[PDB]
Amino acid sequence: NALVGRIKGVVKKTRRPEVMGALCALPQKYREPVLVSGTDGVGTKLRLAMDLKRHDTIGIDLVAMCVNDLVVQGAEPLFFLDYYATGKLDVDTASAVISGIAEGCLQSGCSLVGGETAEMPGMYHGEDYDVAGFCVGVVEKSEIIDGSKVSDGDVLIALGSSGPHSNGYSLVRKILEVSGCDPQTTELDGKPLADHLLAPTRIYVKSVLELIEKVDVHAIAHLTGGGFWENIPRVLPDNTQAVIDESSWQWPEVFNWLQTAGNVEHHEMYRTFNCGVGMIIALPAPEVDKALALLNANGENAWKIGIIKASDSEQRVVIE
Amino acid sequence: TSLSYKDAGVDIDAGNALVGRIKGVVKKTRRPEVMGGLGGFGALCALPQKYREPVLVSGTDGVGTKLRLAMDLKRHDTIGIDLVAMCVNDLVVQGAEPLFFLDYYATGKLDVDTASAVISGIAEGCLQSGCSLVGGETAEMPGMYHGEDYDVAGFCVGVVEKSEIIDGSKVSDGDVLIALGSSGPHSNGYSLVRKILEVSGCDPQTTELDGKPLADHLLAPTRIYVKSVLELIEKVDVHAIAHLTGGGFWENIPRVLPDNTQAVIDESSWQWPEVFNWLQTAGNVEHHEMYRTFNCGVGMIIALPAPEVDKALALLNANGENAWKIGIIKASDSEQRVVIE
């Protein structure tokens, strides 16, 4: 009860006109609407936020991972739900998480329409909590980005990340342990290391939806678990190879610190971390100049990162 | 020494291994509206052609207290049915047809065997509900979950025609209440169940109730009423539907009745299933608390006009439901909203 009064405003303020067991009509502009759905958790980044006593942006991470996966196929995020599971309910901690979820929903354009807080005393020790996220998007059936248009000669455009986002934090915590440094004390390019590590995942919803309306996008890859090696081939047709130009961008410094402090090898960095790339967009070469101009002028860090070539190689991604 | 995700890591491939094993069981739930996605970034499902103004009905849930007892007795083939049943039975309350379902599975180290049995129960619940299991997430957080503990959360999406949303405004003085029998406690009242089991020193596996061990009665999967309720709305003017969950008769029945209306329950119209008689005796529970904690054999209550009762009962009983007239609706002259006589 002490929580529902502190979070009834976030459900009210994120409300879309379509919102009426939560009720939400479909946006009127869709003639043949197709529902796109997904669920997620924040991951090991929860443990780092707990160790740091910083829960103010965990809810942004939760929404971002959901909504970024929806917009990959061209879907407009419609509504969001979360399942807050904990041992003993720390009202201040849950309020900070829900505030972050509300911020993520507002940036995504979707409404926080439902949720639940469950208390499992014997399963969570301390003040631990686990939050599941759930989001539903709508895409026009004819406008689904199914990746079937990815062809030889397409150019790859990368969108910069705000940091590690919400993947690879199991390795982050191991690197911090073996280095023994204090993340709040260790300064890194003028900011504490903890700020680099806890930075909320960037939400690409509005910029991608603006892009699809103006240029012809063939596919989009959200770089999450498994980094480049696992996520890029998910959008590649058979007999195609993605060639990444490693010189086209510099890693944000947090990834250099992680590599050095953990002695992490080249392939492992591109598997565990996004290394500064949140998303990769495949599109035909004549569309690149328009795409880069739109993205960089509308709040993104976009650059030409590579190309797609026809190839029967079993190594679907090359980072040279 | 070069640090890798194998020094700790969540083991994404174990989650990928789980999806590889249960891929066939999940495929069997696929509706015609389901479309293959790009690379699993999101699940694609079209809207059913039936709906001219579709309104999406969504909800999340967990089994919570029943999960504790299910793993304390080390039987987890039906808790996935409970997770789906709680979602989909709530959707049909407003008239929504369940469309698709997603689950969030979290544990310390992924036991692929235990997870596959839970997912198979979720898929089974989706088959009974007519919805598809179209996605999920498996999270490996070794430091947060100790022992063999796991947590599972469900998310469901249903569709309802906008002009047909059931909000209880059609409830009238004189509406007859039909009840749908439950399969047991379903998924509510289980902190009291665990307390009664403790204070009585009862091992529910070696305690026989009517020939079956008490654990079978306590852990019976929640009955799914989707297909019976959707047919009822199709063939009968349904005014309201009460889903008896947490809070029992006293809390859930008024939640669907409009203001200045009262439900009068005829207690002689049914006998409590024996699992509730056992819990009442072993816990010395007041009957008023029984109606507060447990559904006492009544999973759902439908309000509808008196002329349509015979057709409704014939339809429901033809689907295998345990249906009977449980009470009536009358104007509450600033009185209590639920009365059990």
From Swiss-Prot, chain A:
Keywords: ATP-binding, Cytoplasm, Ligase, Nucleotide-binding, Purine biosynthesis
Taxonomic placement: Bacteria, Pseudomonadati, Pseudomonadota, Gammaproteobacteria, Enterobacterales
Keyword RNA-binding: no
Subunit (UniProt): Homodimer.
Pathway entry: Purine metabolism; IMP biosynthesis via de novo pathway; 5-amino-1-(5-phospho-D-ribosyl)imidazole from N(2)-formyl-N(1)-(5-phospho-D-ribosyl)glycinamide: step 2/2
HAMAP family attached to this UniProt entry: AIRS (MF_00741)
Disulfide bonds listed in the record: none
Cellular compartments annotated: Cytoplasm
Iron-sulfur keyword on record: no
Pfam families with a match to the protein in the record: AIRS, AIRS_C
GO molecular function, one term: phosphoribosylamine-glycine ligase activity
Catalytically driven reaction(s): 2-formamido-N(1)-(5-O-phospho-beta-D-ribosyl)acetamidine + ATP = 5-amino-1-(5-phospho-beta-D-ribosyl)imidazole + ADP + phosphate + H(+)
Enzyme class: ligase
InterPro entries xrefs: PurM-like_C_dom (IPR010918), PurM-like_C_sf (IPR036676), PurM-like_N (IPR016188), PurM-like_N_sf (IPR036921), PurM_cligase (IPR004733)
GO CC annotations on file: cytosol
Name this polypeptide is given: Phosphoribosylformylglycinamidine cyclo-ligase
EC number: 6.3.3.1
Main localization, broad class: cytoplasm
GO BP, sorted A to Z: 'de novo' IMP biosynthetic process; adenine biosynthetic process; purine nucleotide biosynthetic process
Protein family according to the UniProt entry: Belongs to the AIR synthase family.
